[PDB]
Design a protein around this ligand. Structure first.
Ligand SMILES: [Zn+2]
Ligand SMILES: [Zn+2]
Length: 56
């Protein structure tokens, strides 16, 4: 467990208020979905999948 129970945008590298699991198995923040219109920034590199869940 960690001192904090929150997520972190893998594309913004900051606190995610309302992050979501993109259709490409990626983790983005709320603002990213609205701003990036559900884009695919994490698709920039073949990152290791298998871990993608919402915030507590
Ligand atoms: Zn973001
Ligand atoms: Zn992608």
């Amino acid at each position: 467990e960690e001192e904090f129970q929150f997520l972190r945008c893998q594309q913004c590298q900051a606190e995610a208020k309302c992050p979501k699991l993109l259709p490409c198995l990626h983790t983005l923040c709320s603002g990213c979905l609205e701003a990036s219109g559900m884009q695919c920034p994490i698709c920039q590199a073949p990152w290791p999948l298998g871990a993608d869940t919402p915030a507590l």
